[PDB]
Scaffold this active site. Structure first.
Site, PDB file in Angstrom:
ATOM      1  N   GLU A 147       0.820  -1.205   0.000  1.00  0.00           N
ATOM      2  CA  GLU A 147       0.000   0.000   0.000  1.00  0.00           C
ATOM      3  C   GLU A 147       0.858   1.260   0.000  1.00  0.00           C
ATOM      4  O   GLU A 147       0.538   2.227  -0.702  1.00  0.00           O
ATOM      5  CB  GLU A 147      -0.942   0.013   1.207  1.00  0.00           C
ATOM      6  CG  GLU A 147      -2.040  -1.045   1.164  1.00  0.00           C
ATOM      7  CD  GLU A 147      -3.072  -0.814   0.079  1.00  0.00           C
ATOM      8  OE1 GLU A 147      -3.008   0.215  -0.634  1.00  0.00           O
ATOM      9  OE2 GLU A 147      -3.954  -1.691  -0.058  1.00  0.00           O
ATOM     10  N   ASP A 158      -6.490   8.086  -0.559  1.00  0.00           N
ATOM     11  CA  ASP A 158      -5.996   7.103   0.400  1.00  0.00           C
ATOM     12  C   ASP A 158      -4.792   7.676   1.144  1.00  0.00           C
ATOM     13  O   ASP A 158      -3.919   8.301   0.531  1.00  0.00           O
ATOM     14  CB  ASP A 158      -5.526   5.842  -0.324  1.00  0.00           C
ATOM     15  CG  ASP A 158      -6.666   4.993  -0.878  1.00  0.00           C
ATOM     16  OD1 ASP A 158      -7.848   5.238  -0.573  1.00  0.00           O
ATOM     17  OD2 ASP A 158      -6.349   4.038  -1.622  1.00  0.00           O
ATOM     18  N   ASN A 187      -7.882   8.504  -5.680  1.00  0.00           N
ATOM     19  CA  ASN A 187      -8.685   7.483  -6.338  1.00  0.00           C
ATOM     20  C   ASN A 187      -9.506   8.102  -7.465  1.00  0.00           C
ATOM     21  O   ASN A 187      -9.718   9.315  -7.512  1.00  0.00           O
ATOM     22  CB  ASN A 187      -9.606   6.812  -5.320  1.00  0.00           C
ATOM     23  CG  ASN A 187      -8.831   6.172  -4.186  1.00  0.00           C
ATOM     24  OD1 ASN A 187      -7.845   5.479  -4.421  1.00  0.00           O
ATOM     25  ND2 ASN A 187      -9.257   6.415  -2.949  1.00  0.00           N
ATOM     26  N   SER A 212     -11.972  10.450  -4.004  1.00  0.00           N
ATOM     27  CA  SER A 212     -11.449  10.216  -2.666  1.00  0.00           C
ATOM     28  C   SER A 212      -9.925  10.080  -2.720  1.00  0.00           C
ATOM     29  O   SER A 212      -9.318  10.041  -3.791  1.00  0.00           O
ATOM     30  CB  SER A 212     -12.088   8.964  -2.062  1.00  0.00           C
ATOM     31  OG  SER A 212     -11.717   7.792  -2.771  1.00  0.00           O
ATOM     32  N   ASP A 228     -12.592   8.042  -8.004  1.00  0.00           N
ATOM     33  CA  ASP A 228     -13.846   8.634  -7.561  1.00  0.00           C
ATOM     34  C   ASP A 228     -13.661   9.982  -6.873  1.00  0.00           C
ATOM     35  O   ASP A 228     -14.652  10.589  -6.467  1.00  0.00           O
ATOM     36  CB  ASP A 228     -14.641   7.649  -6.685  1.00  0.00           C
ATOM     37  CG  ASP A 228     -13.970   7.364  -5.336  1.00  0.00           C
ATOM     38  OD1 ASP A 228     -12.895   7.930  -5.040  1.00  0.00           O
ATOM     39  OD2 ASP A 228     -14.526   6.562  -4.558  1.00  0.00           O
ATOM     40  N   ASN A 265      -9.023   5.119   3.117  1.00  0.00           N
ATOM     41  CA  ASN A 265      -9.757   5.877   2.099  1.00  0.00           C
ATOM     42  C   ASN A 265     -10.709   6.902   2.717  1.00  0.00           C
ATOM     43  O   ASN A 265     -11.511   6.558   3.593  1.00  0.00           O
ATOM     44  CB  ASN A 265     -10.560   4.872   1.266  1.00  0.00           C
ATOM     45  CG  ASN A 265     -11.040   5.434  -0.061  1.00  0.00           C
ATOM     46  OD1 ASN A 265     -11.046   6.640  -0.272  1.00  0.00           O
ATOM     47  ND2 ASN A 265     -11.469   4.546  -0.962  1.00  0.00           N
TER      48      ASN A 265
END
Ligand SMILES: [Cl-]
Ligand SMILES: [Cl-]
Ligand SMILES: [Cl-]
Ligand SMILES: [Cl-]
Ligand code: NA
Ligand SMILES: [Ru+3]
Ligand SMILES: [Ru+3]
Length: 129
Positions: free
Chosen positions: A35, A52, A46, A50, A48, A59
Site C-alpha cells: 500500500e 488514500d 482514487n 477520494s 472517484d 480511504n
C-alpha cells in the site's frame, strides 16, 4: 516516516494488530509494503475523487475526513492527515475498524491481490518480535 520492515512489524504488534481478527502480523506488514512501501506520508488519489492516506492507504470515502470527498463518511472520526503521522496509532485504530467491517482484509485490494494466499510470514522473518 519510512519504517523498516521489522520496525513496522514491532510497532504493529505493540499496537495490537498481531492476529487482530485472525490476521497474522505478516499479513499486516505485507499490506503496508504494497500500500505505502512503509511510508507513513503516502497519499494517492482514487478515480472517484477520494484519497488514500498513510501506511495502510485508508480511504477518505468512508474512514477519515479530508474536507474534499463529497458525500463521504468519517467512520474513524479522524482527519485524514492524522493517518500520515510518524506515530501509527491512528492508522492502526482505524484499520481495526476497517478489517472488522465484514470483508476482513479484502478491504485492501492490494492485500487481496498481492498478499492473500502467499507466504506472508516471510514479511516478519528474522525480526526480533
Ligand atoms: Cl505472519
Ligand atoms: Cl469531505
Ligand atoms: Cl477533520
Ligand atoms: Cl476474515
Ligand atoms: Na470522508
Ligand atoms: Ru507507538
Ligand atoms: Ru461496510
Amino acid at each position: 516516516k519510512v519504517f523498516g520492515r521489522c520496525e513496522l512489524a514491532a510497532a504493529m504488534k505493540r499496537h495490537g494488530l498481531d492476529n487482530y481478527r485472525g490476521y497474522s502480523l505478516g499479513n499486516w506488514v505485507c499490506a503496508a509494503k504494497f500500500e505505502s512501501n512503509f511510508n507513513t506520508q503516502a497519499t494517492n488519489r482514487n478515480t472517484d475523487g477520494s484519497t488514500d492516506y498513510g501506511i495502510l492507504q485508508i480511504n477518505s470515502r468512508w474512514w477519515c475526513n479530508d474536507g474534499r470527498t463529497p458525500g463521504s463518511r468519517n467512520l474513524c472520526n479522524i482527519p485524514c492527515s492524522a493517518l500520515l503521522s510518524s506515530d501509527i496509532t491512528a492508522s492502526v485504530n482505524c484499520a481495526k475498524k476497517i478489517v472488522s467491517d465484514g470483508n476482513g482484509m479484502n478491504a485492501w485490494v492490494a492485500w487481496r491481490n498481492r498478499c492473500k494466499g502467499t507466504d506472508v510470514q516471510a514479511w516478519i522473518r528474522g525480526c526480533r518480535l
